[PDB]
Design a protein around this ligand. Structure first.
Ligand SMILES: Cc1cc2nc3c(=O)[nH]c(=O)nc-3n(C[C@H](O)[C@H](O)[C@H](O)COP(=O)(O)O)c2cc1C
Ligand SMILES: O=[N+]([O-])C1=CCCCC1
Length: 362
């Protein structure tokens, strides 16, 4: 077994390879998109993870696409996150913040000024996001057709990522994870299906990857490359965003470019919840030869699959999502070969302590 052995992840040393995947839970305070002490407790309970990767967190108000998702742009958000990271550190944990801009997976009612959300192109996501009703409960709503960003708006987006990383470093996070997956803004630019631009940010794969690589360079310069991770979902379809007709080649291009920056990690979300074709071993080998940081695999993993791929020298760590919702001490359970708590999906999104901080340890 290698799952319970340490791993250097950029500037941080994880004591094991069992990571907590980023999990949107939609329990922040509105107004202000403010993290809470309840969220702090939840993270503290999971501090034995080799690395906790937070719920996706807004870089800006414009970045918001879900009612109840937290931000990391305001003073009050910074102050609330500082308490949360301090609590994780008091338990000897490590925590990365996942930073997103939701782009077109959003709704005008939760945008600044009530305006249409932004994207690479003016194309509806054709999916749903989560708002809150008059009683504060999560509800699904169809996404609003976005406005295509103007060329002169792009530097501001890059700056918003940079600024949120300054704020994250201040707030006590150990690492940042850029959310370049699952059909959010960065992935909207990467995918030819969502990006129909004919300027320097669309068309060729170099142009489609331009924004994400400008963001990577800005955030490495703000902090350090060894503090930056990135999540990608570059093979298959995620929330109605496919990866185009040359998905493997285009993925390898991006990964070779990322490798040049010497970033801490590449986190590959391999499948959505409905599943699909596994990554080929050949593809995993191509990724591994091109990237010289930590590789984290995710998506309906088992401990056995993680051990197998780590043993094969293809990945370094695994991120578990749903099993971490339900098992605060997932590390101990996997180490001991104990049963896993029963999941309660009705309380994944929104609400309070129930289905959030009430899953027991062994
Ligand atoms: C409730 C819920 C919230 C999620 N939130 C995020 C998120 O904030 N960021 C992200 O990149 N993926 C998110 N995902 C995907 C998970 O990180 C993970 O990739 C997915 O659940 C598949 O892994 P699993 O089989 O271990 O659960 C979410 C998944 C679920 C079930
Ligand atoms: O950011 N994400 O990937 C998700 C957020 C909430 C819905 C599930 C996917």
């Amino acid at each position: 077994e290698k799952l319970f052995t340490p791993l250097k992840v950029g500037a941080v040393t994880a004591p094991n390879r069992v990571f907590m995947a980023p999990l949107t839970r939609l329990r922040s305070i509105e107004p202000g998109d403010i993290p809470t002490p309840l969220m702090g407790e939840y993270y503290r309970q999971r501090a034995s993870a080799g690395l906790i990767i937070s719920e996706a967190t807004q870089i800006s108000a414009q970045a918001k696409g879900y009612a109840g998702a937290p931000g990391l742009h305001s003073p009050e958000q910074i102050a609330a996150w500082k308490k949360i990271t301090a609590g994780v550190h008091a338990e000897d944990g490590r925590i990365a913040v996942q930073l997103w801009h939701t782009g077109r997976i959003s709704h005008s009612s939760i945008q600044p000024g009530g305006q249409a959300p932004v994207s690479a192109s003016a194309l509806n996501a054709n999916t749903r996001t989560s708002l809150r009703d008059e009683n504060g409960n999560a509800i699904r709503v169809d996404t609003t057709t976005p406005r295509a960003l103007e060329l002169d708006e792009i530097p501001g987006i890059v700056n918003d990522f940079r600024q949120a990383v300054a704020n994250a470093r201040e707030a006590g996070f150990d690492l940042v994870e850029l959310h370049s997956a699952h059909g959010y803004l960065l992935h909207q630019f990467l995918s030819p299906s969502s990006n129909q631009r004919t300027d320097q940010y669309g068309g060729s794969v170099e142009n489609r990857a331009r924004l994400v690589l400008e963001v990577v360079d800005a955030v490495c310069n703000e902090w350090s490359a060894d503090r930056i991770g990135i999540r990608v979902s570059p093979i298959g379809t995620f929330q109605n965003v496919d990866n185009g007709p040359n998905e493997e080649a285009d993925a390898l291009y991006l990964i070779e470019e990322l490798a040049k920056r010497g970033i801490a990690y590449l986190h590959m979300s391999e499948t959505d919840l409905a599943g699909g074709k596994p990554y080929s071993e050949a593809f995993r080998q191509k990724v591994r030869e091109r990237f010289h940081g930590v590789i984290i695999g995710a998506g309906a993993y088992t401990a056995e699959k993680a051990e197998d791929l780590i043993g094969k020298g293809l990945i370094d760590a695994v991120a578990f999502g749903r099993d971490y919702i339900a098992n605060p001490d997932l590390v101990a359970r996997l180490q001991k070969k104990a049963e896993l708590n029963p999941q309660r999906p009705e309380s994944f999104y929104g609400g309070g302590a129930e289905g959030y901080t009430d899953y027991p340890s062994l």
